[PDB]
Each structure stands twice: as C-alpha cells, then as structure tokens.
C-alpha cells in the first residue's frame, strides 16, 4: 500500500514510413509484467513475469488487438500534434502515455493516472478528480477543449476505476510470492588511493532487489560530501549502488557504512578491513 499498476506507452513517428513504432509496457508494483512492441516479427503482448503465463490465449489476443488500436490512436494523435505545433513529417516525433491506478492500504482506488507527454514534455494529464485536465501548452488547449467537448474524461474514468482495479487485483493474487520477493544486498568496502595523504573509501552494495536502497557513511557520528551513484541494473534482475567518501590515511577505521534494504533482516554495518 500503495500497490499500483501502470502502462507506459510510446509512439515514435518514423519519416517516410506509413506509421510509427509503438511500445506498450505494463507494470504491477513497479515490475514489468507485460510488454508489446510493434517492430517484433509477430507483434503481440507478451508476459514479462512468470506468473503471467497463468492467463489464457484469449487474454493475449484481446490485449494484442488493443495495442493495434492504440498504435493507430497514436499514428493519428501524432499527425494531429504536427499541425498544432506547425511541424513537418520529415523529422521523428515522440508521444508518450502513463496511465493506471494506485490502491491505498485499504485496497480501494487511491489515485488514477492518465497523462501524456509530447517530445518528452508534459502535454495533457487527467486531474486526480478524473473529470478535468491540465494542459501544458496552448497546443494542449486544442486537445483539452476537444476532450472536454467529447466527454473523454469519463470513459478513461471508467477504465481507471474498473478494469484497472479489477485487473490490478487479479495480477496481485497471481504474483503474490514473486511481487513480495526481495534479494538482499551483499556489501563490501574497498580502499583506493586518491590524494596524498587523503584516500577514497567506497562501500558497494551488490545483488539486491528491489532497487530501492539507502547507503550512508558515518564518521563515528553521521554524514562532508560522499559521492554516490544512481542505482544501476546488474543485468541479472538485481541492482548495484555505491557510496564513496574522502578519508585521511590511517584514520579510516573510524568510518562506517550502512545499507538499508527491505530484504535485509537487519541494516548492514561495514568498514574497511585489509
């Protein structure tokens, strides 16, 4: 709580070609579990989590036919924005969608999401009320008055309160084990010369999942700038992070790292040891 479900769609128009590349990617509780990609040999929705092999062949056929429709919804919407911003079809353009629902700890719908970006900037988003819109540009006003005109908000409201919550619920029962899974970080601190006689101590956390993790250094007390790096996939489903610090030579046994990760039964404490 909040358990959640999103679909992240992307349509990149391709100059010359008749229509665009479209990618849909579904997430439950932030893990990818389904995915459609239009330039695949046979383009279909596919599972991206073992516990989606559960679903039947009618599911995939029906979701695949949705992608095909979305694909065209984007092809159109692309052509239309081209007009709004006075663009040509000689250059590629990108239209993106985030949508779905969060469930509060009481399991009822907490928030709905339906938002768009053009060229990677906010364009139009459905407000939390699920009735109105916020528009970034003048250009989005054209689309806004269109969607106010056509009563677009309600129909998306229905998805968000219905199918989103229905199916999130069913996906959460199906994946329970897998979605609660956590791998613990295996940590070590390494020693690197840097200056003279100042040195770098770097605490690594390796092989963890999910990616949410906190590394902190400590000099008896509590940390002045330690460099850290943005959490990084290892490529095997686990993640990596490090936090380094600048330390005086010899005077570095006083220096402690802590790794906070939900899969850890206890936060780890490390320090350098030759």
């Amino acid at each position: 709580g909040p358990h959640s479900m999103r679909y992240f769609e992307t349509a990149v128009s391709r100059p010359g070609l008749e229509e665009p590349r479209y990618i849909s990617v579904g997430y439950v509780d932030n893990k990818e579990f389904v995915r459609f990609d239009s330039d695949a040999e046979n383009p279909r929705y596919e599972p991206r989590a073992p516990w989606m092999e559960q679903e039947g062949p009618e599911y995939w056929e029906r979701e695949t036919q949705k992608a095909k429709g979305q694909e065209q919804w984007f092809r159109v919407s692309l052509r239309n924005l081209l007009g709004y911003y006075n663009q040509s079809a000689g250059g590629s353009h990108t239209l993106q969608q985030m949508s779905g629902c969060d469930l509060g700890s009481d399991w009822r719908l907490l928030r709905g999401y339906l938002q768009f970006a053009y060229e990677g900037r906010d364009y139009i988003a459905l407000n939390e009320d699920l009735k109105t819109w916020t528009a970034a540009d003048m250009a989005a006003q054209i689309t806004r008055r269109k969607w106010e005109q056509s009563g677009a908000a309600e129909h998306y409201k229905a998805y968000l309160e219905g199918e989103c919550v229905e199916w999130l619920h069913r996906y959460l029962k199906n994946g329970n084990a897998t979605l609660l899974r956590t791998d613990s970080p295996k940590a070590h601190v390494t020693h690197h010369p840097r200056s003279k006689g100042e040195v770098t101590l770097r605490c690594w956390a390796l092989g963890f999942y999910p990616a949410d993790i906190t590394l902190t250094w400590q000099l008896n007390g509590e940390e002045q700038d330690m460099e850290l790096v943005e959490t990084r996939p290892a490529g095997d489903g686990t993640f990596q992070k490090w936090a380094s610090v600048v330390v005086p030579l010899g005077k570095e046994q006083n220096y402690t790292c802590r790794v906070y990760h939900e899969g850890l039964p206890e936060p780890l404490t490390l320090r350098w040891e030759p």
């Binding site: 679909y7 769609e9 849909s24 579904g26 389904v34 929705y45 599911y59 979701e63 949705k66 992608a67 429709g69 979305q70 919804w73 159109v76 919407s77 239309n80 924005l81 709004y84 239209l95 969608q97 949508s99 779905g100 339906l114 768009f116 364009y123 139009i124 689309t143 269109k146 969607w147 005109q149 056509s150 677009a152 129909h155 998306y156 998805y159 968000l160 199918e163 989103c164 199916w167």
Partner: peptide, 9 residues
C-alpha cells in the same frame, strides 16, 4: 489489462 484511448489529440 491496458487501457484503450478515446478522443485522439
């Protein structure tokens, strides 16, 4: 299951 959009832009 994914959404399907209504009025285009």
């Amino acid at each position: 299951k994914a959404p399907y959009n209504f009025a285009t832009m």
